[model samples]
Target: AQNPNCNIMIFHPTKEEFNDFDKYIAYMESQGAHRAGLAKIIPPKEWKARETYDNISEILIATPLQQVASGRAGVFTQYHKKKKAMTVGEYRHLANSKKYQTPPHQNFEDLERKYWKNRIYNSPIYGADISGSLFDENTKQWNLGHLGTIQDLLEKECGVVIEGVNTPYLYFGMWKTTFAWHTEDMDLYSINYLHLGEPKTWYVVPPEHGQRLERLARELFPGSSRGCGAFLRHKVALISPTVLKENGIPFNRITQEAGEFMVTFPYGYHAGFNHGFNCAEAINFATPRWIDYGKMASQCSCGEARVTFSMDAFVRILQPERYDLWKRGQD
Candidate 1:
């Protein structure tokens, strides 16, 4: 039987804990929450004023529509090579269309297979800036700009904004629309808030298992791996959980519901798909520990091509008092 409700640690915070989000996150990380690569946080039910994307219907944009053929586990096929233009509401409509809908309790394998056999579903609006949008005008504790949020680290420490990285990117999801397996840009931490939606299924590999997963990906896609050591970063590969477990790679399955938050740790390889129409807001943030992972990812065989941010500058700004330490370390 396919269990949509697989176990991952979920934090039910009190008023005080919810208010002190940064501390609560650090406390959770210290308590070994990072080992699972993803953790869920449920805010107190009494905390009202959470923002929703009900107003997103008016906005129009282009997004990729992903396609999957039956029985092809590792291949990624998009409905069109180029982006498709449509309103967020139109995407939701297509996503929830009866023509593409499947049985509610279908197992994971059956769910994956039904797509190709029945026709491709899932039209996800990738990354849309929420700065001036309808939902952006409202207040929410999970907003990247909110004080003490992990996504505020770069702006808090470096005094500069990285747009989509530090600021929230609004993502619209429909049934089975997937986010491919990849780490956050430059291996930073990412937090996703499900403003409103059906459950989203996530597959995550621990930071330690990242390399093992990479090794398996390399074995499966030798040509792509040979072409670019950072080929996995392209977000094209799609490997099933069964194949991953069979290869001795440890992973965690998470079901994220509306009003909850899912946080991905540094170097944690994660990928997922939504169960139905949903809107999520996500952004990347860095912790002190992420500096090491950032540096490692920058130096990996991908070289300069993999450098999304200036590690040297970030290190200097973050540890100016000990600039010489990192200077010596980098050289």
Candidate 2:
């Protein structure tokens, strides 16, 4: 049977170890990929010697090769060029400015009210296309162009399997300022891998600590009305160094020489910070297979919500001809 529950796995390899992965990295660079300098992962040797919290497995760093691909995304290689013009104070000021803001839930709702209509489920926001738009209600029906084609491509390419047919890969380019705060999404497994740059800082809280964080955020920012409280209180788990070690899960720290790796299990509450003052490039991918009671309006919090669609749903929706083409690969 296909596994429906979400899980997270992480691995770290030495610089020499990544030779096998060169092909995929080359492919992404060829496609004009850029670095989001969020976090840089360091090798085990460097991490053990560090005294201050200066580095960890989460920070990643990358440099662009001139002979490498160049295009819109390729512009990330030019980060050094831009950094040369700014002083240390200027860079630090910029980093502090880019810090994420914990807006009130009401603020989120207001933004949703203003921008939500433009938001479509499963659709690309801005110009990058992740998949089709969710607002097209017809998508709910079994049809072609739905389900796991993209998922298959990512799995085959990156060796990671996201959980849902409706999952989206939201792209945030380098130099773009954004903050992801202490919050949890309804039953979704989230993973982020740094293709380039210094590793970002990940501040994680255990499940027990979530309740305290949520209450603090709400009490401090009374009118903000953010869902952090509910999200934290109801989260299934939290990702942290201690929690990861206790569970015997694997993870890697970022170094100046290599990139970062992260995984958030279903409903795991955590927050992330950029590793350096410079802009970082990274990929955000999620597989949302499980649905919590709050997600299904018809179901009470105590009731179980059934999943009506999946990658299989995507396969069933494929045109007979396309399905045949896909099956040939399976064969």
Name the best candidate (by lDDT).
Answer: 1
Candidate 2 structure lDDT: 0.30
- Estimate every model's Cα lDDT from 0 to 1: 0.65, 0.30
Task: Please report, as a residue range, the 10-residue window in candidate 2 with the lowest summed lDDT.
Answer: 74-83
Off by over 4 Å in 1: 1-7, 49-53, 64-71, 74-80, 106-140, 145-165, 298-331
Off by over 4 Å in 2: 1-164, 167-170, 173-176, 226-258, 275-331
TM-score of structure candidate 2: 0.33
Residue-level lDDT of model 2, residues 123-178, one tens digit each, is 11111112322122342221112333445544554465655544433222222221
Tens-place lDDT digits, model 1, residues 1-331: 1122323578888876776666777887777777778889887876643444556686665654444433254444333243667787776777677844435766655655553343233334332334322334355545555534333566665566543323456776666667778897668788887878677788898887789889898887777788766777666677777678678888888778888889998898998777667777777777767767765662223332233334455544445554564355435
